[PDB]
Amino acid sequence: TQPKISLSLHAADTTIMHRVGMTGLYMTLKRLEKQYPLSRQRGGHISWFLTADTIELFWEGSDFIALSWLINESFQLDDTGLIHLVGLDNDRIDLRQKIHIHEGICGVFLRLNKFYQAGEIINTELRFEEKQVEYQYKSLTWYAHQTFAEKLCEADTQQLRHDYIQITSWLYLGGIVRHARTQNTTKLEEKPEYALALLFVPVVCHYCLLHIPSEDLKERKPHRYLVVIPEIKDFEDASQRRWRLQQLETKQFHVSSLGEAGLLYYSLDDIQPEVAYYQACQVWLYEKTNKASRQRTLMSIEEIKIDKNILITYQQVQKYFKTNYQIIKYKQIFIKVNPIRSLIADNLVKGIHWWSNFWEKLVIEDSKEYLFNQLFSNREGFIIMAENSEEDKQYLIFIKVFQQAMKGNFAKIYAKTEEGKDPPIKKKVERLRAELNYCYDELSFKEYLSDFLVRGGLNKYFNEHQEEIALLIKKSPWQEIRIWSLLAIASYKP
Amino acid sequence: MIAPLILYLDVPFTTFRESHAREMGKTYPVPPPATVYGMLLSLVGETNVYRHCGVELAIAMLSSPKKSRILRQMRRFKNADFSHPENVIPCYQEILSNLKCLIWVRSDEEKIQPSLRERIQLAFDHPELVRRFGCLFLGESDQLIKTIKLAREDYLEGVRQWAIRDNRGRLTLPYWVDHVGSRNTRFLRYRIEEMDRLSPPDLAWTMVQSPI
Amino acid sequence: PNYYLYGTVLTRYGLASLNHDIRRGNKTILQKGYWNNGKIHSFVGSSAIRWALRFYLQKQGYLVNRVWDEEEHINRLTSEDFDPEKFYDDDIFGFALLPNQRMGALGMNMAVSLTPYDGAVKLGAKSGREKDSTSLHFTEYHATRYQYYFGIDATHLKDFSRILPMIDGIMNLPKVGGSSNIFNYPFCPDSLVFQWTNHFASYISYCFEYCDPKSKEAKLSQEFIDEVECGQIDPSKLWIGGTIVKDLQQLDNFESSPLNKAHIYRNRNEMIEALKTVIKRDLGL
Amino acid sequence: PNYYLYGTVLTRYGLASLNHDIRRGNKTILQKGYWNNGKIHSFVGSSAIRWALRFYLQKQGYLVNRVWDEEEHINRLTSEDFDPEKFYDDDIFGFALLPNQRMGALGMNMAVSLTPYDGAVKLGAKSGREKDSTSLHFTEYHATRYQYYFGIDATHLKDFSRILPMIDGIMNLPKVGGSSNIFNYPFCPDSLVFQWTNHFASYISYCFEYCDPKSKEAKLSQEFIDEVECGQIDPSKLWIGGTIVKDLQQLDNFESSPLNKAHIYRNRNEMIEALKTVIKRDLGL
């Protein structure tokens, strides 16, 4: 029959949020026909025709009852008070991820209590490794999503309105009224179908928790919420992607950068070498302005465009570099994110070399060795990427030169070592690190480096690349040469 | 058919905050047709907005700018008292730096003489004759324009990034802006395609009309 | 007959942490963004300099509708119905309301650090045997020169005589909002590029450029000189003053270049007097 | 009117380690950053000199809201409510407890090192054969003259007579926070460039330069002298005293340059007395 509601991704007036709401409509109707395959089961007899990029609606009788049934079935609340969105497959989602998504949605969409009424704070002690950490969350009772149907349809005729409808920030993120004194007039307006899309946006977007590297996670529980909103190219592709991303563990969702969350949203995407892969998504950062802030405010929006090379490099980093340490304490499941992974990811998104300044972060900045230990755990990975770096070549040759020189020095010590006595190779290595760290200017450090190279003996590598290594020593700032010498000492493996 | 007038644009800082981004000063990558149309009206000293409906505008983006965020204690009309602290709110606004672009103006669809192209040309031949006010700016009032001059298609003799309105594109630029709310705002979906042409593709022509 | 006055002004070399942005528990990040060649430069908001000019106008007579209560650190408004014919601030910076509005007769871009920003910070632990929180603060600072560009339509002014106090204010800019307690950074001009023309477009927006990281030479950008030599941006309307005059006079062939026939003075006050005389003669003050 | 006092001060030559930043490993790095010519210079923070001025005001017997218990190494508040009318430190340095806040008359900048920092370090070790983890350590030091810039607003002072003790404190600055045990660096001035004008524009910020990259010479910068030549920065409002007076008097054509008709005194106390007399005459004290 004729469409009372017509929605197409190809429509010009739509924005990204309208498209993601359209995808939410697509998936919730898919789950509904999975739950109610037969026409008469659904109230009002609302039929939907679904295509790759079009969602098509027909029903019988007055609209009000049809959209009321649709809304009531779409958004629900379980006994525990957590959110229940039929678009997402709650059956195979565990309770921890349900708490995660519910907390996110009340923290970003239902930020205001004028739209929702909460229940009692429900605390449950979930068991991990013989530790019953008490998850404490505020249960809900009602929210404006369940009853937007009254605003969508006309009061007198119980039918969809034929004019623009004023919307609010809970429907469209970022759509606050700047001037409260002009609340009646300066309010965002939209057509009813786009209003329904803005109703159903929350299902598609995932939610992640951000941890400030400067802030000790022990002294600061995470409260910043990152909302990942993906650009829509096809309904089925987005639905499959979201259902795949449902599999991930909550400890993955805790990230240290917006780009990390964006890459995680596309981590489970299939890679096809014949198909040119390209995916785009938006990351919306929500954070309390101050300590006593009542509700979160949108503090950053950043676009991520991921191609094939960036994604495979990110998978390589994930493989080589260690995962998060799920520290668990008194109801305190802290998550230790590796800063390096994020640093690389950031540089990747920037398109700049991953090795922008790892050492700076690993040692200079990381005196505590929080990620320096990760360096120790992932030093090979660092080298791997450095190997990829062609410019590193010269420094790699210098690494081999210094390793040969220290091999010669250790051979000299072995010759000096008396029979029966244990040679202090560990003590000599510690002395090497201390002496290199002692060097305070270019002249002294170059003195020590040249003297050590001479004491090493005949070096094959320094003979083969005489001019290149000589020019590298002459040109490079002595701090850099010291850094790579320390890396050579740390990377020595006979 | 008379060659369409071409303007060279160079703005150090600019921002095109989106219609629905009212909580954040997050901006379009490209100047929207509505903002360009308004700036052209300001250049020709045309206060009325309905005078030059129908003019077709095409934008060629010479270099992709960088997006940067800045903090501002923007003032809002929340409380009746001006001195009340509720008026001042700290929020972030994104800016585009070193924006260089070329604009094609085709005023043949205009039904009122003289057309916008003729007015812009006459303004550029005789700067002293044109009477207007204010300082020419793109986006926010404080974001002045470094260089707007009459130029040919060969001014950079380089490679151009055009803004082609794709029904499946990413950007949703408005060509008519309703400042009060969002009723009369009209959107078109665009894309940035890297093509080596000195003349804009037909699709790249965005023709401004009243929302009615 | 429209008349405008555009100007690119470069400040001195000093240590500055002027504007800042939202902190991260530790560190008070000076806001920054990309610039020429993509290098990150520290910025100073346009509203900061407009606030500085408003404070200058209020500090020396020149009736202001938007008075700044120094004791309370708040902005009190004398007359809710803005009267640009009387108040200097409504005449220049304009106002907004729910008659209805008035576009400000002054537009200035945000100030830009002439040199790219490098990671620099300042430890800030407060003295005392007891070491509680709110200690070890970090203040990101920058040792560069700041260059900002402004433009005024003198015709749009309700009182044409109000251009001169703005000139004195820009010359004697009191203070851009910043950590004067830790980083007292003066904002008085050190080299000016003014142009008083009836043309709407002035191609002198950002002419001071040196890059060459961690340096203070601050040569005139090559593109500005090429634009001057081209034939446009008429040298007769140009006004060059400050320390850059020395480098211009040390340039080879400068005695024959078209830049020679531009109004050029080493002394800043002589520049200001000559420009003010020209403006007063042209506007009939 | 609106009188302000600006000055750039140079210290004597000696070994200084006054601003150790967050140390790494065993070496106590003193804070450093880039400056003129791109060479790393050592910085002493302005908060340290503000603390030194606070301590001077406390010691001389003035009220001072914040009392510093030397034996306890703790800071106490005489009254929880800041009263700039009664307390000198609240009047001058300002406050923010979080009325509530004051702008603060004294605005001071960082103390830069006139000579670039080579990287000299000093080893210290605990005596005795019994050696533990805390046995040996490295402390970074610098042999330099330090230079900082400050600016105060005479009108902004709640009591105008408070400008005299601050000048006396600057000329008699107590110890600036550092390591006095092993690097006792006196911060007493030995060459001043003071400006006391009604306009704000200041062109004396960091007007000192080194003759040789590693030397104790401390000649006046070329830019400052050239700007005095050109016509701005009126010599009648200039106040130069200290060791630089000898170098200025040994310059050629000094009797003809505008520097001749500026207030120059070999003895710093005489120049301070003259400037104090001028200030007391100007502000009716």
User: From the list C22, C25, C98, which residue is nearest A212 (CB)?
Assistant: C25
Alpha-carbon gap, residue D147 to D142, rounded angstroms: 14
- Per DSSP, helices labelled H in A109-253 are 149-152, 192-204, 235-245, 250-253
Q: Which residues of B touch C (CB under 8 A)?
A: 10, 12-13, 43, 66, 68-73, 77, 82-83, 85, 90, 92, 95, 97-98, 123, 127-128, 130-137, 141-149
Q: In the sheet where A224-230 sits, what is the strand order?
A: A254-255, A206-210, A224-230, A278-287, A297-307
CA distance C110 to chain B (A): 8
Verify whether the Cβ–Cβ distance C214 to D112 is below 8 Å.
no
Residue A193 to residue A171: CA distance in whole angstroms: 13
Beta strand D238-242 with D263-265 is parallel
Q: Given the DSSP bridges, would you call strands D74-77 and D32-34 parallel, antiparallel or unpaired?
A: unpaired
Provide, as residue numbers in chain B, all residues whose Cβ is less than 8 Å from the Cβ of A300.
69, 92
State the CB neighbour count (10 A cutoff) for residue D178.
19
Q: How far is the C-alpha of B21 from the C-alpha of A172, rounded, in Å?
A: 9
| Structure-token match 């400030």, residue found | A212
Question: Cβ contact (<8 Å) for D73 and C183?
Answer: no
**Is the Cβ pair D202, C182 closer than 8 Å?**
no
Distance of alpha carbon D64 from alpha carbon D91, whole angstroms: 9
Under 8 Å between Cβ of A268 and A252: no
Cα of A212 to nearest chain C Cα, Å: 8
Q: Quick count: other Cβ atoms within 10 Å of Cβ A299?
A: 18
With beta carbons less than 8 A apart as the criterion, state whether C257 and C229 touch: yes
- From chain D, pick out residues whose CB is under 8 angstroms from the CB of C70: 103, 156
Is C38 part of the contact surface with chain A (CB cutoff 8 Å)? no
Of the candidates C34, C21, C15, the residue with the CA atom closest to the CA atom of residue C120: C15
Left (φ > 0), alpha (ψ -120 to 50) or beta: where does D214 sit?
A: beta
Determine how β-strand D136-140 pairs with β-strand D27-28.
Answer: parallel
C158 φ, ψ (degrees, to nearest 5): -70, -40
Pairing of strands B88-106, B5-14: antiparallel
Which residues lie closer than 8 Å to D240 by C-beta, 6 or more apart? Answer: D191, D192, D193, D194, D248, D262, D263, D264, D265, D271
Question: Which residues make Cβ contacts (< 8 Å) with residue A196, sequence separation at least 6?
Answer: A5, A21, A25, A67, A152
User: CA angle, corner D66, sides to D61 and D69, nearest 5?
Assistant: 80
Q: Is A8 within 8 Å of A53 (Cβ atoms)? A: yes
**Taking a contact as any Cβ pair under 8 Å apart, which residues of chain D between 17 and 56 contact chain C?**
19, 21-22, 31, 33-38, 43, 45-47, 50-51
Asked if A300 and B69 come within 8 Å (Cβ–Cβ), the reply is yes
Q: What's the gap in Å between the CA of B87 and the closest CA on chain A?
A: 9
Closest by CA position to C149, among listed C192, C203, C109: C109
CA distance linking residue B197 with residue B102, whole number of Å? 12
Chain D neighbors of A367, CB-CB under 8 A: 22, 24-25
Nearest beta carbon to residue B20 from set A186, A188, A280: A188
Measure the CA–CA gap between B198 and B204, rounded to whole angstroms.
Answer: 13
How distant is the Cα of C200 from the closest Cα of chain B, in angstroms? 7
Instruction: Take residue C2 and report the two structure tokens written for it.
Output: 């429209």
Closest by Cβ to B181, choosing from A17, A187, A301: A187
Q: Which residue has the tokens 């672009």?
A: B101
A181:C98 CB<8 A: yes
Using CA coordinates, name the residue in chain D closest to A364: D24
Nearest to residue A285, comparing CAs of A342, A371, A222, A347?
A222
Q: D151, C270: Cβ pair inside 8 Å?
A: no
Cα–Cα dist A57/A197, whole Å? 13
- From the list A437, A438, A441, which residue is nearest D118 (CB)? A441
Taking CB atoms within 8 Å and a gap of at least 24, the contacts of B87-90 are B90/A289, B90/C22
Residues of A in contact with C24 (CB under 8 A): 212, 214
Which residues in chain B have their CB less than 8 angstroms from residue C155's CB?
133
CB A490 within 8 A of CB A369: no
State the CB neighbour count (10 A cutoff) for residue A225.
22
Sign of CA dihedral A376, A380, A385, A386: positive
The closest CB to that of C25, out of A179, A214, A299, belongs to A214
CB A6 within 8 A of CB A22: no
| Closest partner CB to B20 (pick from A15, A185, A300) | A15
Binary contact (B182, A188; C-beta < 8 A): yes
Query: A367 and D25 in contact by Cβ < 8 A?
Result: yes
Residues 6 or more apart whose CB falls under 8 angstroms from that of C14 comprise C143, C145, C185, C186, D109, D149, D205, D206
Peptide bond preceding B114 in cis form (omega within 30 of 0): yes
Contact A175 B20 (CB under 8 A): yes
List Cβ neighbours of B48 (8 Å cut-off, separation of 6 or more): none
Backbone φ and ψ of C220, nearest 5°: -70, 135
**Please, which experimental method was used?**
cryo-EM
Interface test with A, best of B15, B18, B23 (most A CBs within 10 A): B23
Residue of D nearest to A363 (CA): D24
Check CB contact under 8 Å for A16 and B170.
yes
Chain A residues in contact with chain D using a Cβ-Cβ cutoff of 8 Å: 364, 367, 437-438, 440-441
Give the CA count within 13 Å in the CB-facing half-sphere of D61.
Answer: 0
Q: In angstroms, what is the resolution? A: 3.2
In which residue are the tokens 């001389």 written?
D60
Interface test mutation site (partner D, options A214, A436, A437, A442, max chain D beta carbons within 10 A): A437
Q: Which of A185, A214, A300, A302 to mutate to test the interface with C (most CBs of C within 10 A)?
A: A214
Please give the Cα distance from C30 to C28 (Å, whole number): 6
With contacts defined as CB-CB under 8 Å, which chain B residues touch C74?
Answer: 83, 85
Inter-chain CB proximity D38 and C215 less than 8 Å: yes
Q: Which residues of A touch D118 (CB under 8 A)?
A: 441
Question: What are the CB-based long-range contacts (under 8 Å, 24+) for B183-190?
Answer: B183/A164, B183/A189, B183/B211, B184/B211, B185/B19, B185/B211, B186/A13, B186/B211, B187/A12, B187/A13, B187/A14, B187/A15, B187/B19, B188/A12, B188/B33, B189/A12, B189/A13, B189/A14, B189/B165, B190/B30, B190/B163, B190/B164, B190/B165, B190/B166
DSSP state of D221: P
Inter-chain CB proximity A215 and C27 less than 8 Å: no
Coil, strand or helix at C208:
strand
Interface of D with C in 90-129 (CB under 8 A): 93-94, 99-101, 103-104, 106-110, 112
Pairwise CB contact (< 8 Å): D206 & C14: yes
Least CB-CB distance to C149: which of B128, B131, B144?
B144
Residue from A278, A207, A198 nearest A237 by CA: A278
The count of residues in chain B is 212
C-chain residues within 8 Å CB-CB of A299? 22
Contact flag C98-A179 (C-beta cutoff 8 Å): yes
Touching subunits of A (3+ CB pairs, under 8 Å) are B, C, D
Strand duo C238-242 + C263-265: pairing: parallel
Q: CB-CB: which of D94, D200, D231 is closest to C188? A: D200
CB contact under 8 A, A440 and D120: yes
**Residue D209 gets which letter from DSSP?**
E
